[PDB]
UniProtKB/Swiss-Prot annotation:
It comes from the Eukaryota. GO terms for molecular function: identical protein binding; protease binding; serine-type endopeptidase inhibitor activity. GO terms for biological process: acute-phase response; blood coagulation. Inhibitor of serine proteases. Its primary target is elastase, but it also has a moderate affinity for plasmin and thrombin. Irreversibly inhibits trypsin, chymotrypsin and plasminogen activator. The aberrant form inhibits insulin-induced NO synthesis in platelets, decreases coagulation time and has proteolytic activity against insulin and plasmin. It comes from Homo sapiens (Human). The reactive center loop (RCL) extends out from the body of the protein and directs binding to the target protease. The protease cleaves the serpin at the reactive site within the RCL, establishing a covalent linkage between the carboxyl group of the serpin reactive site and the serine hydroxyl of the protease. The resulting inactive serpin-protease complex is highly stable. This is Alpha-1-antitrypsin. N-glycosylated. Differential glycosylation produces a number of isoforms. N-linked glycan at Asn-60 is alternatively di-antennary, tri-antennary or tetra-antennary. The glycan at Asn-23 is di-antennary with trace amounts of tri-antennary. Glycan at Asn-224 is exclusively di-antennary. Structure of glycans at Asn-23 and Asn-224 is Hex5HexNAc4. The structure of the antennae is Neu5Ac(alpha1-6)Gal(beta1-4)GlcNAc attached to the core structure Man(alpha1-6)[Man(alpha1-3)]Man(beta1-4)GlcNAc(beta1-4)GlcNAc. Some antennae are fucosylated, which forms a Lewis-X determinant. The gene is SERPINA1.
């Protein structure tokens, strides 16, 4: 089990970037979805463009040969897609290539082999049809969670890359709908609304960490998955965010001490949309997003470069479990206007696959959106 330790650090790194831009908006993204897409793309990149990408994903070529990295992803992806009898989890990569655009064989085979990618040739001259195919791919993979992902597509498009992840799990310790109650929340500084709050009194695998300055709760999903929640102490949100690390989570995953407690978890339906260019730029990956981008490993008759890279994720939480989807489109997609209002006691969460110890999703909940 390799590359998962890097994937984890990549998560926190990316999380911290989004976290220090605002502290009053909900956050949600899939490290796996983002890492798989850029890792696969690097196979067609060269020089700095290439090195910046793998390095920006928390990979150092001096510690692990590139061959093993692309290899670690191939196995990770194979393991994540292995059918689990108790939960649903799937990830897929798709390439939509322009008919008439000459490509590099080596690239087509590296992706299909290493990232189990699917290659589709489409006519981008028929923009409505090209979008439909892409959108049908994501909607099929996200089981209806994300439909009509791409609203507009450039006429001159010749290459498109999309990644999707889907997860649905049931709490081993579910809540009771009868115990859910409407509660007051300040939508703005001057008006409140009632939102559904789930409640349950019993034994929980809770604990408190000094280094993180917060309470840590573990919510197992039937299957090989788990959800860890972090409730920062007063004024210690920023502290939690910067202190989260792979090891810490490890020291907490090996604690079977459960105590009695009254859990209050709001019914949630959150989303997250981000143009990763600036954010990933902050991690060292900038060349591929510039004109000096070298992706001559994809095609030799087009000056490929990433102009935009939007990540979209949706997560629903209720009494019985969790359902979440994520998609990565390496092009333009509209941004949303998240509502900004902190209900004083925000929390961070991380959804993890016990089989590979990989972080499927990570977020921050400050607003009880029901969207
Ligand atoms: C790791 C723990 C994760 C649990 C996170 C719970 C977040 C909330 O739901 C917080 C929210 O619930 C209320 C309800 O009154 O607070 C109660 O529950 C929290 C649970 O931690 C208690 O600490 C509070 O004392 C309770 O009042 C909201 O007021 C609160 O903001």
């Amino acid at each position: 089990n390799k590359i998962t330790p890097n994937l984890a650090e990549f998560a926190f790194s990316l999380y911290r970037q989004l976290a220090h831009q605002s502290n009053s908006t909900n956050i949600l993204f899939s490290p796996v979805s983002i890492a798989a897409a850029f890792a696969m793309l690097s196979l067609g990149a060269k020089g700095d463009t290439h090195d910046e990408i793998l390095e920006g994903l928390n990979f150092n070529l001096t510690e692990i040969p590139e061959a093993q990295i692309h290899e670690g992803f191939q196995e990770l992806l194979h393991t994540l897609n292995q059918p689990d009898s108790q939960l649903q989890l799937t990830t897929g990569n798709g390439l939509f290539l322009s008919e008439g655009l000459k490509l590099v064989d080596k690239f087509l085979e590296d992706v299909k082999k290493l990232y189990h990618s699917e290659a589709f040739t489409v006519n981008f001259g028929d923009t409505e049809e090209a979008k439909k195919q892409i959108n049908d791919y994501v909607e099929k993979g996200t089981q209806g969670k994300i439909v009509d992902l791409v609203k507009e597509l450039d006429r001159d498009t010749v290459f498109a890359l999309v990644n999707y992840i889907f997860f649905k799990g049931k709490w081993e310790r579910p809540f009771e709908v009868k115990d859910t109650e409407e509660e007051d929340f300040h939508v703005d500084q001057v008006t409140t609304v009632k939102v559904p709050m789930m409640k349950r009194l019993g034994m929980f695998n809770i604990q408190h960490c000094k280094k993180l300055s917060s309470w840590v709760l573990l919510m197992k999903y039937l299957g090989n998955a788990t959800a860890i929640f972090f409730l920062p102490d007063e004024g210690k949100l920023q502290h939690l965010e910067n202190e989260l690390t792979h090891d810490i989570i490890t020291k907490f995953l090996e604690n079977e001490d459960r105590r009695s407690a009254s859990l209050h978890l709001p019914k949630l339906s959150i989303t997250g949309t981000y143009d990763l260019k600036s954010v990933l730029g902050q991690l060292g990956i900038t060349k591929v997003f510039s004109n000096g981008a070298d992706l001559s490993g994809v095609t030799e008759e087009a000056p490929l470069k990433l102009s935009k890279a939007v990540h979209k994720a949706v997560l629903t939480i209720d009494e019985k479990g969790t359902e979440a989807a994520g998609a990565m489109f390496l092009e333009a997609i509209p941004m949303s206007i998240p509502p900004e209002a902190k209900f004083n006691k925000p929390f961070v969460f991380l959804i993890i696959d016990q089989n590979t110890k990989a972080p499927l999703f990570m977020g921050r909940v400050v607003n009880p959106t029901q969207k």
